[model samples]
Target chain A: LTAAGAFSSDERAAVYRAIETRRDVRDEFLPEPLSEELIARLLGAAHQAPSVGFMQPWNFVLVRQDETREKVWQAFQRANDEAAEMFSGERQAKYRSLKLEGIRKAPLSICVTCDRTRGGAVVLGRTHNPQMDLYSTVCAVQNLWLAARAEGVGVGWVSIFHESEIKAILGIPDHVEIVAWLCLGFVDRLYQEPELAAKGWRQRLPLEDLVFEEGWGVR
Target chain B: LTAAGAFSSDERAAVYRAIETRRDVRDEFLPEPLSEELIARLLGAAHQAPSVGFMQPWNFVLVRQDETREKVWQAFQRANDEAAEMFSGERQAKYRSLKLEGIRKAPLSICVTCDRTRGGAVVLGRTHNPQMDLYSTVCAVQNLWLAARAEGVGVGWVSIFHESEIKAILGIPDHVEIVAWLCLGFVDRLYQEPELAAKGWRQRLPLEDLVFEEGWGVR
Candidate 1:
């Protein structure tokens, strides 16, 4: 009888609803901007994400200027060209394309980064795992994603770049690894499925197939 | 007024509550076992995580056997001992110690792995950055963590192991990278603050200090 920190029925439904409905929005940005309050709230949620050994190894680099976005977009285009060439056949045709709207149309973009050296050399959980800091930044990214979904703000992660390119563009330090380039804005509509899936690039894998009872393949 | 798909205000509060209350639990596990449905619900929430290119490259290798836990704990101890010596000063003294409850007292442990080759060679978002798949798994981990929090299940991520040792212990393939070894169980209480912070390991960073506008140092 000890279900500890259970959210109320309505709260639980809302949590799951946000999770189920959150999409990696690409092209659904509205011209209307997110309120400063909303942006603060979403980023605050991200800042509270669980980090290894309390190593909050994260930073939010906000980019709203079109000039900066254009430069970042140029970086994206360079990578996208290289990416498109990688897929060469009919299935390659369905490799489809990513939305440029994530770079250009979204009212704001946040470059999430992991300051690898934030918690000194011997971080508690990071003693053996060097990338735990990067992973911690990703956890922050996900928290931002979920909070945005609840706020009706869509987020699109634009990851097509050499990390160095972004680091130089944003004036980030050499030690900080770019975790995500998340474009955020209010949205009027979003797909019920992942934009990639909706466009026939990929389909959702069966949940049961991914779950194992006690071993790698012991379904 | 075009905020679309926004959760009701109450729902929004609940979402934020879960985010803020969720902890990287250690040592507060209860003997009460979680129901199968609850576990599935948590994993299902994880399954819906927004992955790059919709490549659901994650597998939940659930572990319940005491032998496996003991083996994994041994790997942790090996790495942990190595970690302790790295910090040889007074601060090192405060790195304190991790809770073994996560490994032994928890009813269930999940070895979350990232199958890097799941979506083929030229995955959509993975065209440039190779670590997107690994980051995607961390997003899945965050989803599971939040869902577990709302469901009153405590999650403690044990990261004190060489990936190779954990892979060999769990019989994981070389192609798959271990992302997290999460312990889950019901808990009657959790630290009001991070266990590490409460124990004086580190303090939370000021939110404004970590945020920037347009450029790195343009606070």
Candidate 2:
């Protein structure tokens, strides 16, 4: 069984459904709380993520208190206000109008961090690429995202705040790098496409344009 | 059913099973090639990954020629030899004995790249964190990896080589960053645990230790 082959057609379709239907929740989050058991399952799926040299260099900080969410939202507001100026004219207005985060609205927020000092000095796959650990943590985030989709939980990754700002608010250590701040809750709805695409902020590129043969631009 | 709640139990189990059982292949690869239809499915799954500000900044360079794999293997060899020296005594000996890559044995190698310049100069969520695009690309890698697991295809991510070397070999543009070099193939057998854990390179960390309540060290 260790050398297992393809899944049943139904099983494969279910996996695809989760992948395709998963959304980055923001305004659609419901106030109803998610069960601790379901939360455990999501975290469990994240823990099972593949790591560089099996470093498993990730920690999930469960932030449930409304007071903490308020503070985090304040940090996002400060950075986002500054970020608005980075664009101009219509782009800036559109950016401002977007509902980027669900910090206080979502029932729970998870701060995922990468403890670079974890494991040891010599990580196998990380010997050449020091960023592998960070990438590994992203894999874990995707796992939780996919798992949350299967469980009908809505997850929105809020990245509008400065990492240091969140570090101070969440009491995250300087040595740890905060990779993602995700808001989680049950949802009443989701966009059929990415919210940005629907809002004319961006559009998905064709897959054929991205895939090449053997070498770059060699299709 | 856009407000989908929970998957059927068997569907949920299948998703979890793929996550838990997926292994990084090394010596178990078979010579048989994966069909184009299946490869398309894997890439489609990857394209569905979440991106910052909807910046779909990933590219796949599919390498199948033996000559190209040989050159990539050579690149791996030079860096690996340098890496092996990073350790000393028994640690060095143990590192050398471990099989790190299946570059030659695997039937296909995929070079996943991140086009940082994609989605224009100012990306939405990427405003605060510059690394978000790279992280987004890694999310795509995880989607493809998980989808590969459901398809019974084994993938080994080899990151021991210098990025510059692979860039030169693949003729990747200067603006793009190579995120992952994945070896794909069919497998006859697989490791029950992480090979690193089984071989004593490292151990699986306890999930409880990695989880915190509200802040750092607050478990």
Candidate 3:
């Protein structure tokens, strides 16, 4: 039963702390360049993410050029506007006022993609659930986000865009799926709470309602 | 450029270390019960994961009864066999030999699910891509995995199962999609490298090959 292979108490606490404090940042990014080494370390953290059958399906597309960021912003603008329209009255107004993307503000950006063809046709664990590769890529993104938080770098995931448009703008291959567009930079602050929570857009659900012992709602 | 918001040097290192060391455990789980406090802490870590639009759409179904785990094992077997058939010759043999689940061996198992209706009709970030909520659940799963690794508790994501079977077995509602089935327990040893990589089932793709510049393949 005893493995004697776990991290020290202090090490374990740090992991939880990172999980608790990590935020999806927007508007707080400082207009400062991130060092290549630091960026590399973050990417390395992302690369370390566990993939289904070790397929390691994730790819990072670093976006630093001003023109490209602008193009991406355009894509976001269209989607954001459409997204805003989905809400009505006060909600729609609140949505528009929210600073959703830091694309132009953040010093750097990264587009994470999944190459389904990388691991050949028959991915071991992906045979039943084909979405495993896509989900594996999300795991990588989470690692990057948490590592960035530990480094005090801000990250905002911009998912409000047409995948085909983003592919065209980023010159991404047709077969590849664009998973996320993240704005990365040093930030003046990381909100003590999630921006959406603070803005009254949505509230966090209680964990008690979400946890079921043995069977669903059998707690 | 300095945000004065980053973690201390030690904290940063622990985050990266956890990310680097986390694994999709299969065969190394020791038959040991995790303490109640430890399981709560791991769940806490998972609950703290950043959610899109702060919707917090994740649920954890904790399965501990031998009867329930055996039921899950059957689900895994059905899917695993189908997964193996998808391959051919040597690859099929390799896939069959690979140990992909620790449902029976692990002392505790958790099934993570996503409630798409949790945030009501229009979640802010999910307006465009309806999968955002599902992806958000994956982030929580990633946190649970990393935290388990830090605590020396191995976490194995068993995705080789039919969702409907799992839902029925766990008494999960039809509306909720089971995102992951994770086996949790003390492990004899964590692999130095991914088991899939060691087994020649799949090799990790180089980070450079996956990364692109501003535009895809413009590196």
Candidate 4:
């Protein structure tokens, strides 16, 4: 009983491929609305993500109004400029060309948020690591990203914004962390590879360097 | 462009769906072996994962020998006991029954490693935060995980182990971190949700509780 599929389930392979092929779509968005059923399916996939002690701590604020997107755009502009300074040289050049967010153009923008206080203080896997809830939220994000890809909905994570501004704009409450601001829509084409890769910003790593026999720093 | 295939290509959707449906399989494995071509293709997919500044710093050690897996099992046992002490009540009972690894059951165990020295000292993205390289490796893990999932392969990431013991057993070199311990093979079933969630060890949280308006905890 020692084969590739012996340890891994069929679903595992599908999920990993999605991660590999998923692109943060920003420039190639089409401005059309997603069907309610499709939206629900994607959201359902998100809600199905893993959490700490069954303490699901996430929220999605779906944005479609033009005025709301305008405000969000303003917030994005301020932060995008600030974030640009973090890079320099050829890297900066690549960064400049890389459209980090698709906030305005996409048919829908979903803001993925994390609530750290979902299951109170007695979360089973979160005692020593309270961040597990947040991490679990990330897992949900991953689920959403993958689901969107499967549904043929192009999505981009827009991180360039002031969280306060977004909160005010979206009428969100306090005590929740904005994990991701995603721009989702139907697009003309998905990059054969990641945009960063296409732009020569970064290259892919080999697998041999990532594995360890037993411990850290021991290859 | 606002339809299902709006921004993403058909191939991309397939890949993304692959990621969403993939699983971390531990139990329900079959006794079989993966073909050389299938294994190579999966490895190739892993190799295509993004890295920081084009620094390809990763490795993979394919272990099929019984002796090597036995040592890994021992390490898992030692860690599993320690892990049990931290759990209490129902969760602990469930953890005891959950099979977290298929090292012995799986036909093959591929160890993913990272080599931080692939691109030299001043790699573009590693100048300010060297940890980006590690995150890049994680991306590789995601890639491998997704790709394997597409092939209907079960991949179980085993984090419970004495790192040094596994290192010594595998005769690994210094300066490499053990990124993940993966058990790969075929599965009898693909879980609808995560193992932890199914066993009532944990659950998924909602998205709203984790979002913040601007600053940390600022709504």
Candidate 5:
């Protein structure tokens, strides 16, 4: 971990598989609790992710208390129901049956927030793109997600609720941006493909379609 | 390989580090021919990257012919000069000295292109945002970049060029979009940081300036 180039070939293949198989899990979580070691490892992996200018602007708030989780759950319910109405006809029924969150079902939830003001000005590479830091945090989220996958933990990113209500429940400061709200738990099985595809939410696009030769319309 | 979780811890760490260290190389390319297997592996790695709806709308044109490279190189020159004039004062001199391309010097020059018509009408998630397909193609570029890093191949994206002029050179059809022009080869050396930041062309910004909690002003 001293440098990025030191990993072996087999390890690289494993990482690539992780990137491919890890899902944005919304269901399929068990109520069993995660050990302290797993939790620590997940957070540590996130912390070690790349950042724009090494700003390290992410903070994690674990929401295990049922009272706080209950409030977040209510917010999701309202939004989910509204979302259901938006998709009428056949899609509506499918939406109703669709499992989109494990906030209440999962044993623990971690709110990933970004502090945009951490490094101030004069930080490296932040001039043209201000979004770098947030992206850095996303990279951290990816790191944690992959790490969680390696540890056999199911992780789901929950983003359907009103920010104010969730923030209020977590007592997060006014300045921090909640980039990700994740539900963590053990899974009886992890899907090789994304849950959406398995549940018919979507399908994988072909490789040739997304690639081109020289320009957009060329090939 | 099926149902394999994310990368192993060592691989994950290596990958994150690679992501951090991977430079959009525009300098330090060696004037040596790349092995055929290396090129194939790089493209294969790219093909393995994630795509939204699995709509891989990407294509690669391997250009090794001197005449074809000449046309593209000329286009890059015109735009590079134009871009140089836009910089201020001393920065102009620095920019001029910056070796921004390996198209002519490197062993392999490629044009990465995008097609909008890849997935047809029901491309799932793409109905909401068509650009996701393009972003998915860019993910291929990222995968290619990372694999190139692992292979010790330096790639530089030459940003200066009239899209249409190069399109004309490649005889690219009317529908494709030119995503990136890449120069690939063995490198004399990889810089510790991005070339632009290393020189005073630009500096890396801190991570905190980019992230927000729930919204922009929040963090």
Candidate 6:
């Protein structure tokens, strides 16, 4: 009964559907709030994520007040301006035209951080790559994002900000790394395609071009 | 109805179940060959993950050959030994006893890579943090892990190896960053808890301990 070992067919489909439909939402959030219980469940799903050497290095900073979002949004603007200058001509214009963050519009925001000092200095899987803790924290973030999407709570990862500014606003410690600033709320509609793709900023790479059979470029 | 905007209660539970049950398998992987179709589904799920600016910075290098796994296992041993030396006393002993990878036992291995140049010279969301691309690839790895769990496939993220060693074994390009080396296969039994947790390597950090309200340390 090999099939017994797997999820029921319907269960498997549910997992795939969530993966497929999960979107990084921006500009679509309604002005309604999410329940504290729902936020708790999303954070719980994040907590369940696997970590390097079981070092649960992630922390969530829930920001609901307008003052915090205003400071964070200001930081995003500064960085966004600098980011735009990095491009030129058409690309720069396109980047500016895109609404990249829901920092102000979403009912609340979650700032995910990684504590490098957790699990002592010598984490098992993090020995070779000290950045494994940060990566593990990102795994928790992905879980939170997907769970939010499944629950119909839109999540927009806002990465365009100076770490120093974010830390100052959130009062994060010097040693803690802010991995993500995510906007969460109910949405008017979920975009069928990624906003970037729909906006023609970039398109998804096909599987054939990305997968290698046994080695690099061995497709 | 507002319910149309969200997953049904049953749907939300399924996603949470996968996230909660997903494990970093090591000792429990049965030496059963995964069908090509099943592996394709896993890879497809990984491919479908959301990325920064829709860059799709991931590439999967599937390895099934015995010789390559032997080389990887040897590399793991070298890294694992160095990792053990980093700890002391009881911690070192506990770390040594924990089974961290199924490199030899798993029927297949997938080396996930991030091509930094995939989206062009400058990516949209990667303006502030250059590591956004790598983090996006990690989201794909999480997706792959969750999907595999839903399908009853076990995944072990073997990170205890030098990047140079893995690139050399897989013939990965210099510019490409290898983010994860995952061991994949059917399993004898899935641990109810993470192997690290069961073996007392470390326990799960309480959600309350990790979450802050509006600011860091603002519990």
Models 1 onward score TM values of: 0.96, 0.98, 0.96, 0.71, 0.66, 0.97
- Interface DockQ of candidate 2: 0.74
RMSD of each: 2.3, 1.3, 2.1, 6.0, 6.2, 2.2
Identify the candidate with maximal DockQ: 2
Return the lDDT, model 4, position A162: 71
Worst 10 residues of 3 chain A by lDDT: A1-10
Error of 1 at A54 (Å): 1.1
Kindly report the docking quality category of candidate 3: medium
lDDT by residue (tens digit), candidate 5, A1-219: 112232367645654555555665667777888887778777766765545545677877767778777888898888767656667688778767877779888888888877777765434334433544665566567667656766678788666666777777767777677767789997757767656667775576554454443433345
Instruction: For model 6, give the RMSD to the true fold.
Output: 2.2
Give the Å shift of residue B100 in candidate 2: 0.9
Q: Model 5 scores what on Cα lDDT?
A: 0.66
lDDT of 4 at B147: 68
lDDT of 6 at B120: 84
Writing each residue's lDDT as its tens digit, candidate 1 over B1-219 gives: 122576899999889988988888767888788899999999999998988888899999989989998888888888878888888877766654546337888889999999988988668888888889999999999999999988988998988888888887767887888999999998768777676777778888899989999999797
Docking class of 4: incorrect
Off by over 4 Å in 1: A1-4, A96-101, B1-4, B97-101
- Candidate 4 chain A has its poorest 10 consecutive residues by lDDT at A1-10
Give the Cα error of residue A174 in candidate 2, in Å: 1.8
Q: Per-residue CA lDDT of candidate 4, range B82-179, in tens?
A: 77777688767766787767888988887766666766545644543355455455555555666666666778767666667776777666776556
Docking class of 1: medium
Name the regions of candidate 4 deviating beyond 4 angstroms.
A1-21, A49-57, A65-79, A89-94, A115-139, A159-177, A204-219, B1-22, B47-61, B112-143, B146-150, B161-179, B190-219
Model-by-model DockQ, in order: 0.65, 0.74, 0.65, 0.21, 0.16, 0.62
Candidate 5 lDDT for residue A7:
35
Model 2 lDDT on a 0 to 1 scale:
0.91
Minimal lDDT window, size 10, model 2 chain B: B1-10
True contacts kept of 5: 0.11
Among all windows of 10 consecutive residues in model 4 chain B, the one with the lowest summed lDDT is B1-10
State how far residue A174 of model 1 sits from its true place (Å).
Answer: 0.9
Better of 1 and 4 by DockQ: 1
lDDT of 3: 0.85
